[PDB]
Design a protein around this ligand. Structure first.
Ligand SMILES: *[C@@H]1O[C@H](CO)[C@@H](O[C@@H]2O[C@H](CO)[C@@H](O)[C@H](O)[C@H]2NC(C)=O)[C@H](O)[C@H]1NC(C)=O
Ligand SMILES: *[C@@H]1O[C@H](CO)[C@@H](O[C@@H]2O[C@H](CO)[C@@H](O)[C@H](O)[C@H]2NC(C)=O)[C@H](O)[C@H]1NC(C)=O
Ligand code: NAG
Ligand code: NAG
Ligand code: NAG
Ligand code: NAG
Ligand code: NAG
Ligand code: NAG
Ligand code: NAG
Lengths: 435, 80, 347, 274, 49
């Protein structure tokens, strides 16, 4: 009755049968299946001289666990800019893959590697792609580590093809997001002098390629500074890249079939009901989805295939009688057994008006009396009604009665029998027509 | 290529579907495309082909048949 | 009628998550308004049904034989014998009509348990989806037995003689004599009727015997029955499918948004879904109100048709079918009434 | 307009209706409407004061139907509430923040800077335009419905108020006698007066009567039945009230021979004598 | 959005900002198309009656 006074939001609600807002669902269950994953390999990054920006090193991590904190505490972050994800979510999540672009980069230039920038870094050195959830980081490497410093910072200031008979036409060649420049091959390990307009400018098979290396001998700072372009992917693989954790023992689903449980199965995170079904789909893919990319299946390590039904809320209705201040509750389309087992119900239903099975579902607060009515004001569906009790204010479960029509017997004689009135009255029908 | 036989379709990675139809974008061949045919010889190593989006190879279509090299026997698949 | 549907607005918009629930309140009494509008629509539907069945109610009847009244075979229009295909009040032709229409069973009594037990079967089922999405299909006011009783009491109505007023007396005139009077009034003399008695009865039985064959989408009325069923299903589909619209957010799942983002970004992305789902629920409520208004007007029309073509004989042309109207019968159809207008077709 | 309808004068009964104007008093018009539903003149003459008393009794209790337990009055109040609901939905929507910091443009101009201000005001603008579009659409639908219903109300006035209806159920339940229409909030309110019979009696009726002659003459009743009573004498009765009267040409019409007609050789009615 | 022309949005903005500004126009056009379809359905039902 409070769910009614608050689902239609007033003290004064008239008699009727109302749908109300249900109660929350529990997430206590955990069905977790995690492989014994190897550690991700942050060794090529953590040792040696980092490359320049146009010769960035790419790392792709799949099917491993990361001790990210051990890596985050090595570097000294200065600026980050995340798009579609956050660093905390990166530190706490599971992914199909993790892609890292890392290189040496000076902090004074971190605006040239900003979305929409107009300089030479986004034209010839590195353009960040935004197809996946990605994030930029600029950080300083402490000296005591195994990471060494380059001679300086270098970049590509001019990449161009000279075309025409006299090579008098100068046309720029620009990079696509996430790719390398054709001009990378002139000075792979960095330019040795500022302004290194190369002397021969290798003649390619469609014209003459021109590079300039005004990407200077730009003095190395006292501490090495680096750029990191992080990107993550979801749902593209059967395995996941997950943080290092200890999660106890929740690996079994054998005797938890039918209960709403949360789950973390090779990275995929959610909640739902697991039910042993017949194996469909491809077992090699380990997941069965629907047309909307919702998980509706799972091939377990035990050897069984389970349908993943989202754990649902039991519908509930309130029959309200205002004159006698009496009410009852209908659990629409639910057998009373499932009600007696389940929960997600209000405080007064910790609990002879007990669970009664009707044609519209289990009801609480109705006394079955096998009575009939003709005109009733609280219909419940399927010719069932709820009658306010005139004496016990408990509502009773009645039925709408079909009164039979009176039969007049035709005669076996020559003519027929007709009923002709002997009195009458004047009825009055009232009708409203809106104009 | 016959789309009614699902010729050269790359299966979705990390997931599967059962008993449903749906549209899906990606990288697919063109229906009715004939492609280039190579026989295992001569002249193949001299020709450079663009890779633009990749390609799909059909291997062993003539196996368990009667034929001979083109430069009599039972045919077999030869893994390009 | 139309299928009566109600929406748990809070569960539909916020899917249980608490941050959405606290963010939902910057939009007024939206969920309360949705609930109240749907409640009013369903209440008006129930009142419409009650009025219709009170209007088509018979108050006096006469006994009818089981196979032959005179020489007229009314077997297809009568409730059968001990066969009793679990309704005991649905006639043979009504059984055939309901067997030729495909309808998803809503499980008004134990459908929740069936949906949890089944699992795989009926992928993308709309009856099962009501428990995930958060909408409820409400059961009709009367079960099929009582509506079958109402429309089966009409075959034996009396109503008084054909040459009199029509609601003052009750003349217990057999079915064959009533048919012969109805043919006498369209311009067929008594001599012709007496001469061609058995021929007339044979042609009438030929006509009734072939009304099974009209239960195809080639026939207009059967296709309209299936159209109404499809409109009922289409409303539920449009309701359940809108929950996967992202409305410009990273995902349409609140769990993913809470997973991947931080407080301010999370809040903006959740506001996107909230606003989209409220607009779609408003659209659903508006269309349900329009559909219920239309169905109530059409129920009034159906009552008029019963009173003019079933209980009496019509002199208007084209109101009770094509030709010269003789007698009409009405059975129950999914979401309405199905009529059989018998007309004189000269050659 | 609606009060001029009570004393409205059209053509008499038994005539076209809009050609002539007959100044027939109200009581005579009521008795003609009663005569045409199957109540003979003898019954009307006998039960004059009883009929007037029953009409005055029915007409004196129509005020008691002004409750929501009555369908039509509840529909009047439903129309009123729909009118109020449109305005309430229009006025309440101005507090929708639509995802902005507030619903007040003053607050947004109070708390934010130029670009953020413009974004939030854009939110409010877009929300309000969408809600206004919805309001306009629903007003169009409601007004078109009300125009069709006004056409139906005109039809009902012409059929039930200015004339007696032979259709069943168009002017209420029973046998229509007379209807009255008053004004109501946003529409019309009708009072349909019908003939409601009680206490029927079983009698034996005849399809028709025939004499025994060269090709026999046969009769059938006009707006009534040939009933026995309560070597057998046949009487005529109206279909709406039992009162046996002698069979004459005023209540019988000549029809063709039929095999279910009675064959009379004794006490032949006057139409069947040569 | 900055404009109602997709060409202008592709001129003046970068990838993320372009995507947001195009999403604005997308969602608006879908809502207006839904409104058009609904009113056409109402008009056609009325015309049939
Ligand atoms: C992840 O990295 C951290 C930092 O290297 C590890 O923390 C160390 O754990 C050992 C356990 O023997 C302690 O003795 C050290 O003092 C810890 N160092 C710090 C700075 O806290 C942690 O063990 C690693 N986790 C795994 C499982 O690889
Ligand atoms: C492409 O594939 C389809 C399916 O194998 C082929 O269509 C079938 O062809 C056989 C032989 O004519 C018929 O018996 C089947 O009934 C066809 N199936 C269908 C559904 O059409 C089709 O022939 C192939 N197309 C081409 C261009 O070769
Ligand atoms: C290999 O690449 C380097 C630059 O990465 C280029 O200078 C060299 O010419 C290439 N090898 C040959 C044989 O050209
Ligand atoms: C209610 O009580 C009657 C009494 O006989 C019983 O037959 C019936 O099964 C009970 N339950 C319902 C739903 O009618
Ligand atoms: C008149 O009708 C009333 C009830 O309507 C009934 O009690 C009474 O017996 C009737 N009078 C006669 C004379 O039939
Ligand atoms: C597959 O779906 C069809 C409907 O598209 C259904 O008839 C069939 O039973 C389904 N098969 C299985 C094995 O579920
Ligand atoms: C009456 O019709 C039914 C089927 O409609 C048929 O089975 C039966 O034989 C018919 N009766 C007669 C007497 O022909
Ligand atoms: C019908 O019978 C009654 C009862 O005897 C009698 O009073 C009445 O006069 C009869 N009607 C006639 C003779 O028309
Ligand atoms: C009247 O007489 C005719 C013979 O001319 C006979 O056919 C008919 O059945 C008789 N009617 C009755 C009902 O007595």
């Amino acid at each position: 009755l409070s769910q009614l006074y608050c689902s239609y939001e007033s003290f004064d609600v008239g008699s009727g049968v109302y749908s109300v807002s249900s109660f929350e669902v529990h997430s206590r269950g955990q069905f977790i299946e995690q492989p014994n994953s190897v550690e991700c390999d942050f060794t090529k990054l953590l040792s040696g001289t980092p490359p320049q920006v146009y010769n960035f090193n790419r790392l792709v991590f799949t099917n491993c666990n990361y001790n990210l904190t051990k890596l985050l505490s090595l570097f000294m972050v200065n600026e980050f800019s995340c798009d579609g994800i956050s660093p905390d979510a990166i530190a706490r999540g599971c992914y199909s893959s993790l892609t890292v672009d890392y290189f040496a980069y000076p902090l004074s230039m971190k605006s040239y590697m900003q979305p929409g920038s107009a300089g030479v870094i986004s034209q010839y050195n590195y353009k960040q792609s935004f197809a996946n959830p990605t994030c930029r980081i600029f950080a300083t490497a402490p000296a005591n580590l195994t990471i060494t410093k380059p001679s300086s910072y270098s970049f590509i200031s001019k990449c161009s093809r000279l075309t025409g008979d006299n090579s008098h036409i100068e046309t720029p060649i620009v990079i696509n997001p996430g790719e390398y420049s054709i001009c990378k091959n002139f000075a792979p390990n960095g330019f040795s002098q500022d302004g290194d307009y190369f002397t021969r400018q290798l003649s390619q098979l469609e014209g003459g390629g021109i590079l300039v290396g005004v990407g200077s001998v730009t003095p190395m700072t006292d501490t090495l500074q680096m750029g990191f372009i992080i990107s993550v992917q979801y749902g593209t693989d059967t395995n996941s890249v997950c943080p290092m954790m200890d999660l106890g023992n929740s690996t079994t689903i054998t005797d938890k079939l039918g209960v709403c449980v949360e789950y973390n199965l090779y990275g995929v995170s959610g909640r739902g009901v697991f039910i042993n079904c017949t194996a469909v789909g491809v077992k090699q893919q380990r997941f069965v989805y629907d047309g909307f990319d919702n998980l509706i299946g799972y091939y377990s390590d035990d050897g069984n295939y389970y349908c993943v039904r989202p754990c649902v809320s039991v519908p509930l209705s309130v029959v309200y009688d205002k004159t006698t201040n009496s009410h009852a509750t209908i659990f629409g389309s639910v057998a009373c057994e499932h009600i007696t087992t389940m929960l997600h119900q209000f405080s007064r239903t910790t609990q002879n008006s007990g669970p009664l099975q009707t044609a519209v579902g289990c009801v609480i607060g109705l006394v079955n009396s096998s009575m009939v009515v003709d005109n009733c004001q609280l219909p419940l569906g399927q010719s069932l009604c709820a009658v306010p009790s005139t004496t016990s204010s408990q509502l009773q479960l009645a039925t709408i009665n079909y009164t039979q029509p009176q039969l007049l017997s035709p005669l076996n004689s020559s003519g027929f029998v007709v009923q002709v009135p002997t009195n009458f009255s004047f009825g009055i029908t009232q009708e409203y027509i809106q104009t | 290529i016959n789309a009614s036989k699902a010729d050269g379709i790359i299966y979705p990675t990390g997931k599967s579907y059962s008993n449903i139809s749906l549209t899906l974008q990606g990288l697919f061949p063109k229906h009715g495309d004939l492609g280039e045919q190579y026989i295992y010889v001569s002249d193949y190593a001299t020709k450079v082909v663009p890779f633009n989006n990749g390609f799909v190879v059909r291997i062993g279509a003539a196996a368990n048949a009667t034929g001979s090299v083109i430069i009599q026997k039972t045919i077999k698949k030869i893994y390009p | 009628t139309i299928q009566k549907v109600t929406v748990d607005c809070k569960q539909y918009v916020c899917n249980g998550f608490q941050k959405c629930e606290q963010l939902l309140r910057e939009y007024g009494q939206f969920c309360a308004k949705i609930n109240q509008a749907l409640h009013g629509a369903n209440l008006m539907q129930d009142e419409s049904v009650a009025n219709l069945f009170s209007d088509i109610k018979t108050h006096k009847s006469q006994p009818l034989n089981a196979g032959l009244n005179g020489d007229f075979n009314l077997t297809l229009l009568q409730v059968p014998q001990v066969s009793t295909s679990q309704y005991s009040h649905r006639s043979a032709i009504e059984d055939l009509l309901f067997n030729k229409v495909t309808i998803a069973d809503p499980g008004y009594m134990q459908g929740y348990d069936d949906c949890m037990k089944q699992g795989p079967p009926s992928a993308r089922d709309l009856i099962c989806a009501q428990y995930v999405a958060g909408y409820k299909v409400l059961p009709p006011l009367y079960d099929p037995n009582m509506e079958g009783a109402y429309t089966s009491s009409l075959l034996g109505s009396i109503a008084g003689a054909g040459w009199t007023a029509g609601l003052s007396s009750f003349a217990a005139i057999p079915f064959a004599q009533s048919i012969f009077y109805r043919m006498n009034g369209i311009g067929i003399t008594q001599q012709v009727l007496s001469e061609n008695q058995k021929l007339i009865a044979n042609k009438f039985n030929q006509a009734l015997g072939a009304m099974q064959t009209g239960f195809t989408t080639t026939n207009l009325a059967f296709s309209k029955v299936q159209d109404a069923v499809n409109a009922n299903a289409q409303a539920l589909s449009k309701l359940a499918s809108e929950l996967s619209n992202t409305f410009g957010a990273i995902s349409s799942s609140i769990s993913d948004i809470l997973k991947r983002l931080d407080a301010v970004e999370q809040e903006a992305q959740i506001d996107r879904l909230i606003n989209g789902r409220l607009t779609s629920l408003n659209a659903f409520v508006a269309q349900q109100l329009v559909r219920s208004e239309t169905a109530a007007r059409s129920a009034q029309l159906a009552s008029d048709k019963v009173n003019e073509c079933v209980k009496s004989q019509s002199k208007r042309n084209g109101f009770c079918g094509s030709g010269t109207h003789i007698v009409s019968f009405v059975i129950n159809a999914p979401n309405g009434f199905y009529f059989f207008h018998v007309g004189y077709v000269p050659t | 307009y609606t009060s001029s309808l009570l004393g409205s004068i059209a053509g008499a009964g038994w005539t076209a209706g809009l050609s002539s104007f007959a100044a027939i008093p109200f009581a005579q018009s009521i008795f003609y409407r009663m005569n045409g539903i199957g109540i003979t003149q003898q019954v009307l003459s006998e039960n004059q004061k009883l009929i007037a008393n029953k009409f005055n009794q029915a007409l004196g209790a129509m005020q008691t139907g002004f409750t929501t337990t009555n369908l039509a009055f509840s529909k009047v109040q439903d129309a009123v509430n729909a009118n109020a609901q449109a305005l309430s939905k229009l006025a309440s929507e101005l507090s929708n923040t639509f995802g902005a910091i507030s619903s007040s443009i003053s607050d947004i101009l109070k708390r934010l800077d130029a670009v953020e201000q413009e974004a939030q005001i854009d939110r409010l603008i877009n929300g309000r335009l969408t809600s206004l579009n919805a309001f306009v659409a629903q007003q169009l639908v409601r007004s078109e419905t009300a125009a069709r219903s006004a056409q139906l109300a005109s039809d009902k006035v012409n059929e039930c108020v200015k004339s007696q209806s032979k259709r069943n159920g168009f002017c209420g339940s029973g046998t229509h006698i007379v209807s009255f229409v008053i004004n109501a909030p946003n529409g019309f309110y009708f009072f349909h007066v019908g003939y409601v019979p009680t206490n029927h009696v079983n009698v034996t009726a005849a399809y028709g009567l025939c004499n025994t002659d060269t090709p026999p003459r046969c009769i059938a009743p006009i707006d009534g039945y040939f009933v026995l009573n309560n070597v057998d004498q046949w009487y005529y009765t109206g279909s709406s009230f039992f009162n046996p009267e002698p069979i004459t040409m005023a209540n019988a019409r000549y029809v063709s021979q039929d095999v279910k007609f009675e064959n009379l050789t004794n006490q032949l009615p006057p139409p069947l004598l040569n």
